Amino acid sequence: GRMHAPGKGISQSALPYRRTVPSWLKLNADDVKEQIKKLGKKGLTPSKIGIILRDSHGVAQVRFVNGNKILRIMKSVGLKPDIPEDLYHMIKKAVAIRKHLERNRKDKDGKFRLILVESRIHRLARYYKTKSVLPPNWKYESSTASALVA
Amino acid sequence: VRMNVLADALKCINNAEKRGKRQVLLRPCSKVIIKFLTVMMKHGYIGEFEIVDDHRSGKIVVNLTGRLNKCGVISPRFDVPINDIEKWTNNLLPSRQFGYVVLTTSGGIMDHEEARRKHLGGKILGFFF
Amino acid sequence: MGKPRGLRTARKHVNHRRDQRWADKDYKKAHLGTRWKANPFGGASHAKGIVLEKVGVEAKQPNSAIRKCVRVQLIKNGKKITAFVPRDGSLNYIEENDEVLVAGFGRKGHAVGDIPGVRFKVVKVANVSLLALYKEKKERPRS
RNA sequence: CAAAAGUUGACCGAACUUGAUUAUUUAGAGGAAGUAAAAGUCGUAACAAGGUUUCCGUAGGUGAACCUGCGGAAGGAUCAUUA
RNA sequence: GUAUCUAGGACUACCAUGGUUGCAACGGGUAACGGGGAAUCAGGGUUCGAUUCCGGAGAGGGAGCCUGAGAAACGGCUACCACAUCUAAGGAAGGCAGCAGGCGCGUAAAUUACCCACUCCCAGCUCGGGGAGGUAGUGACGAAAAAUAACAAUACAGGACUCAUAUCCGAGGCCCUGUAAUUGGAAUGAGUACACUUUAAAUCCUUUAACAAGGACCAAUUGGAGGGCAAGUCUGGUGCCAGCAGCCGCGGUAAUUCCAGCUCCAAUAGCGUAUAUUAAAGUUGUUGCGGUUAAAACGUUCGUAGUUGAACUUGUGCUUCAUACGUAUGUAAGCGUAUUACCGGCCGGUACUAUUACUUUGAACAAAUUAGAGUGCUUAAAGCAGGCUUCAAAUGCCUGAAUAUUCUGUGCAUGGGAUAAUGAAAUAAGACCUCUGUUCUGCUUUCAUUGGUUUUCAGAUCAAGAGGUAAUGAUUAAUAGAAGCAGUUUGGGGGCAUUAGUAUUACGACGCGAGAGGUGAAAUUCUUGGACCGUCGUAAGACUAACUUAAGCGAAAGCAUUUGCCAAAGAUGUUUUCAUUAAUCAAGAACGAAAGUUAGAGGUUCGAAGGCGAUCAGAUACCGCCCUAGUUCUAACCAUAAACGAUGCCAGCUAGCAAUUGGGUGUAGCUACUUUUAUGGCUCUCUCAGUCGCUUCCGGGAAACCAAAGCUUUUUGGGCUCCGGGGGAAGUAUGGUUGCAAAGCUGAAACUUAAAGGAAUUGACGGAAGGGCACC
């Protein structure tokens, strides 16, 4: 229940039942493989391909209209990110609080936060090594981490 | 985290038996749950229960009758041979007359009064009386 | 709540009890075993001793009397004892600095009655069995 | 031919002087505590608004209990209206 | 390599840098020989095992070694040490933890007896030897069996009884019951001893001729009589003495406890006392404790070890018979098919197989013990014997000497696939049963014997095709979690910049006068012409009122002027993404009010200490004045608090009602005017995330109470961690470790003691409110 900060809330997205539907959707499985390649070449994450394939185009769920996921599409077209998106924004957050602090010292909250967000890294840098999506000998260092955002 | 998923159907049946409800909405429907209530259904301690399906985990709406008192769940699943199966029927079962200890033997989930007939031993699941 | 209720936690369950039977006040004479340290005899049942005095231990409040005890030095270890002689008279059976078989006092280490902190009891003085002396069921050794 | 006493050297190595350390027991001027505790002297700190509400953390001070400062708490003497 | 019987760092030589541990290595302790087993309860268990059987060690200490098949032997030797002996003084010799003894030690342990007859061992051996073994004396460790009377009229009363008569009453009373140093009748064996038997011999028991009870004799005790706890308000003595007493308590001059006497009770050849141990003890708790207030939730969160982790992946059908009784259903097979390649007559034998955990059935392994069926040792504890027309001949076969559990546990077989982990096909294996090779590695048979030359065969393995039909291969997206997002936000959340506000002190001036401050009352203290007051003005440091809440935010500590910036965050919105990434956590890590410390600034008010003034019997206090460290800002240290919700954390459930902060949503609402509008406000409706109150359990609790302190049920089970075990001593002593230090974390025991404590009732219309009286 919010694993590092003790609010207990629930919100989410709720998928509906009928996995097959819609039938009226004029967009087929072929062109979204192009359109993900069209949008993913602009360097967007699999999430922000989804919420723009959803609103504008607009397909409800890409797993339904195509027998893969949005990430698993992007690997099959050679658009693989070197670091996955969850470890990215948790690194990219962790490098901001490590940049705010080197100027603004004396802030115990951003010291305590960066403990709470470097701890989420080393547990998700640890799951990504057993499933071997990222290689072994992979310790996120807090020094060289600035270079792996831009 | 939701550790034991058998257990809190049995604390939703027993909890909603005490206040005397007639229908009970479990979540999220193990196939050890349905094997358990069917053991409770051959003895009539439960109504006919319907499994309202999702593509997530399952949800059961159970009909209650009002014949039972307590369905519990022996966590962890202690390994119960046939020889120490009698030890538990003193403890969990309130009389030599009635009551049941559901256990998973390898030949399918049965209560003790079947496994002491089919000469099977297994691990314990729960009980009811 | 509390216990490590898994099925593979019998290591925690035995290392917990091992570490928490020390707080069982009476199972700290299995563990620390102070018998050879604080008992006046080194863990035995009885003790032969040699009387040194005749101590008139006065009674504790709210009972007034004077208990007429006896301060023994043993022969076992050279500890010191204040023992006790019961059942009125029988200080007249002491014949001082002659040997005594003191014994435990039946509350397993504490003084019992109105006696303050005296933990023992004479059972034989000069080998003639004091309970066989109030009747004088056997003869007192006098010469 | 064989072979004793003797003998050279490696080895096993008692034992004893030392040096150490370990585990125990113990002596001691003085000092400073605890308990017995009943009857001593002085005060009256706490329990009632115990006559300065009581306690907590810390810090200084005082014959003694204790007193004072800063921040807590109610286990308070207020579950609080009263526009 | 050497050595050994042999492996081996066993040892040497060179060379490698390894091994081990929070799943407890290493060191320490042991009043430690290990096991069989013993003690004790319903289970679960604690405790014990020096001791007869098995394994191991040792013969005063350590070391050494000969003979041997076997000994690092000690009823072999060799030293040395210790202890000790005979010595004519030169020398010589010692080893009971074998038996029986002796000294010691201690609370604590038998006779310097007999025998190889038994069991078996030994030699050359049928014979010899064997204080092994067996007999005996000693022997209330222990366990079993059982002697202290039995019977009879009167008896002396109770009672029925027949009956008079009945709130009475007696007699015919009597099955009875007792009392009867009344009367008896006396029934028998401890004695008792011929002789037997038993035995190596002898004794003991069993048989036994003779001998053996009116109690005084053949003569039971040991503890107690307030309660616990069975059983005298009996008499005398003693008077807080003597004593009793496990606990609670008796005795302080009429003792239901003391000293006795009478009585009485409990067990009884047994009983008391001590220490130990077990059960009582759900007071060590896995079953099974407790933690708001009784002892007990770390200040906070992070977090490895560890423990624990959602759902999903061959299930009932359909037909039959076996099968309970028209039916039922529990049956096996057919049939949504590796119900499996072959040969045999549905049938043997074969060819032929993802594990693990758990479970079924087996094997394997000494008895004794234990559980125990069999068996009249006179019964019994034991024992492993024993039965039997044989009645008049025995020939008279066998029951036997079971069977499972402590020989738990590991380990080994086999049945099962529920539960539970692991495992596949995504920088590549979908296959081909395969004529198969488009690799070549070959490999042995026939070339009688044997190969140079090479094919079949290619037993083969690995390339190998484009012999690629391939449904070709990727489970759901948890009201798990992390992540994203015109998002829309919201908040005393955090940091730094910016500024504001009155007020306080001070200082200036201007004016006015002499009193001003303070207290219950004073005084210390300030002030002549100018304090205090008024007034405008300057400088300062501190603090953020009113708004202000049962309002928000934060991990806890904590957090309020404006604004700019700065990274952060919960919630909601989400047909976005990832797909178990999770829970909780020893060690460890960060944060931590106040006080305090080190250095630097500042320094208004307040102000530990200090000094006064009072007050008081005293006052090192409260009250009053002066102020110093401190308070404040950056730099670090400290690491605690009633750090409190005296309530760890994650998850689900079990009820109303009222508010109430965010966000969402519908007005089939008003209202704003920019306009009927639209943004904004309000009201109504619904929903998340909640929070706070009440109402109640129709749940719990010792209660006060609690919507969790509930579902802790009836011996209960959602995970996980920390903690408590009568009160003191004592957060002390000592060791380690951290700190500049203050101190922090770890942390006892000797000793002491029976209560200490929790919650609630009733006692003060006894120094507290609110009432209400009267001339004690």
Side-chain angles (χ1 to χ4, degrees):
Chain A
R2 307 306 97 74
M3 74 105 82
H4 273 173
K8 270 178 51 184
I10 172 65
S11 162
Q12 65 170 23
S13 60
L15 266 179
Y17 191 96
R18 293 191 311 278
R19 327 153 69 202
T20 75
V21 308
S23 45
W24 52 265
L25 192 58
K26 314 295 181 197
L27 185 44
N28 41 4
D30 196 330
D31 181 52
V32 281
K33 187 199 302 308
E34 177 266 354
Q35 266 308 103
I36 282 158
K37 192 201 193 66
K38 152 79 178 313
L39 271 307
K41 276 166 74 71
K42 261 177 288 178
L44 275 306
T45 80
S47 41
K48 292 158 271 153
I49 294 170
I51 48 178
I52 73 184
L53 278 194
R54 157 163 80 84
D55 301 338
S56 79
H57 276 50
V59 48
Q61 181 85 88
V62 184
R63 298 188 325 269
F64 289 166
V65 308
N66 160 269
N68 296 322
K69 312 202 185 167
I70 283 178
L71 170 73
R72 220 151 65 195
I73 281 167
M74 278 161 51
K75 188 212 291 167
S76 90
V77 299
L79 272 295
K80 208 52 172 188
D82 278 14
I83 312 181
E85 55 98 24
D86 40 9
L87 267 179
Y88 199 75
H89 307 106
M90 299 193 301
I91 277 178
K92 193 171 139 182
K93 213 179 304 159
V95 78
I97 322 174
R98 217 174 263 279
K99 194 185 296 173
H100 158 77
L101 271 170
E102 57 99 3
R103 164 158 158 77
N104 290 160
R105 294 289 167 190
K106 276 184 52 210
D107 190 346
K108 306 298 175 317
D109 194 74
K111 273 137 178 171
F112 186 74
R113 288 302 179 273
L114 160 69
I115 272 173
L116 297 205
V117 82
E118 281 219 340
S119 299
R120 292 192 228 122
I121 286 161
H122 292 302
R123 299 155 80 175
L124 193 40
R126 261 202 301 167
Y127 162 74
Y128 277 170
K129 291 195 237 206
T130 89
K131 301 287 271 298
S132 199
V133 46
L134 59 87
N137 312 54
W138 208 81
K139 186 201 173 305
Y140 147 72
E141 296 254 1
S142 66
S143 76
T144 178
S146 307
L148 319 170
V149 161
Chain B
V1 298
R2 186 185 285 273
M3 297 262 180
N4 194 311
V5 64
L6 170 66
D8 211 78
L10 309 174
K11 281 192 212 175
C12 298
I13 291 183
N14 171 231
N15 267 13
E17 173 254 339
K18 282 194 192 72
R19 307 263 295 157
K21 302 276 165 86
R22 310 197 106 166
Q23 277 209 5
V24 169
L25 199 156
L26 316 176
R27 186 166 83 81
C29 194
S30 279
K31 78 181 170 270
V32 176
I33 289 190
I34 314 161
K35 280 174 178 74
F36 204 104
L37 322 170
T38 37
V39 181
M40 286 207 277
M41 208 164 53
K42 306 308 173 322
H43 310 291
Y45 293 80
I46 206 176
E48 283 165 344
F49 65 102
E50 311 159 13
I51 311 186
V52 46
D53 162 89
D54 270 359
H55 291 279
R56 279 138 181 92
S57 290
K59 317 176 54 180
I60 317 173
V61 43
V62 168
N63 297 45
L64 256 296
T65 74
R67 306 182 184 169
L68 78 153
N69 308 289
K70 176 76 159 73
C71 42
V73 43
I74 304 305
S75 177
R77 318 261 188 86
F78 288 111
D79 300 327
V80 172
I82 305 173
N83 318 117
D84 45 3
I85 217 165
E86 181 39 54
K87 162 174 99 85
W88 293 99
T89 69
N90 288 337
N91 305 325
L92 306 176
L93 308 183
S95 280
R96 227 180 291 156
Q97 311 296 324
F98 63 96
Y100 279 101
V101 170
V102 182
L103 64 149
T104 166
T105 187
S106 289
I109 299 193
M110 68 193 53
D111 56 82
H112 75 301
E113 285 171 12
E114 292 161 36
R116 261 173 89 109
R117 295 191 281 130
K118 293 196 207 177
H119 200 17
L120 266 173
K123 315 184 172 179
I124 189 168
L125 285 192
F127 63 100
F128 59 100
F129 50 79
Chain C
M1 297 284 184
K3 287 181 221 203
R5 226 208 287 270
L7 161 68
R8 294 189 312 202
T9 88
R11 177 174 34 227
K12 174 71 174 160
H13 268 308
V14 303
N15 282 63
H16 200 189
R17 196 55 55 203
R18 183 175 304 175
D19 296 23
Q20 287 269 24
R21 270 163 74 181
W22 296 325
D24 217 6
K25 177 174 283 288
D26 41 22
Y27 275 58
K28 260 199 300 195
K29 293 172 279 290
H31 286 243
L32 282 183
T34 47
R35 315 296 200 119
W36 297 271
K37 328 181 188 170
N39 192 300
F41 33 77
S45 197
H46 304 285
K48 258 172 210 154
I50 282 183
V51 173
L52 298 200
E53 277 210 352
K54 286 186 174 208
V55 278
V57 184
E58 201 215 0
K60 274 176 61 178
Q61 281 202 326
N63 273 329
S64 284
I66 290 143
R67 290 310 167 188
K68 321 300 185 313
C69 311
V70 46
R71 211 183 70 229
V72 181
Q73 174 165 344
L74 298 167
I75 48 185
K76 174 161 196 162
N77 44 20
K79 294 279 273 291
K80 272 279 195 280
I81 296 189
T82 294
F84 172 57
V85 44
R87 261 157 85 163
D88 46 350
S90 53
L91 275 185
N92 327 112
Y93 300 156
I94 280 284
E95 65 276 352
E96 303 161 346
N97 314 277
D98 201 350
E99 90 167 2
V100 61
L101 175 64
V102 301
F105 201 35
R107 222 194 162 213
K108 270 86 83 170
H110 313 160
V112 306
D114 301 311
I115 316 103
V118 161
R119 287 97 71 89
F120 290 94
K121 198 186 57 179
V122 171
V123 74
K124 273 205 304 198
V125 45
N127 303 50
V128 296
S129 66
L130 263 188
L131 293 185
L133 285 189
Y134 319 113
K135 302 182 173 173
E136 211 75 30
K137 265 204 75 183
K138 297 292 171 174
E139 184 40 79
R140 49 194 185 180
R142 292 298 116 171
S143 69

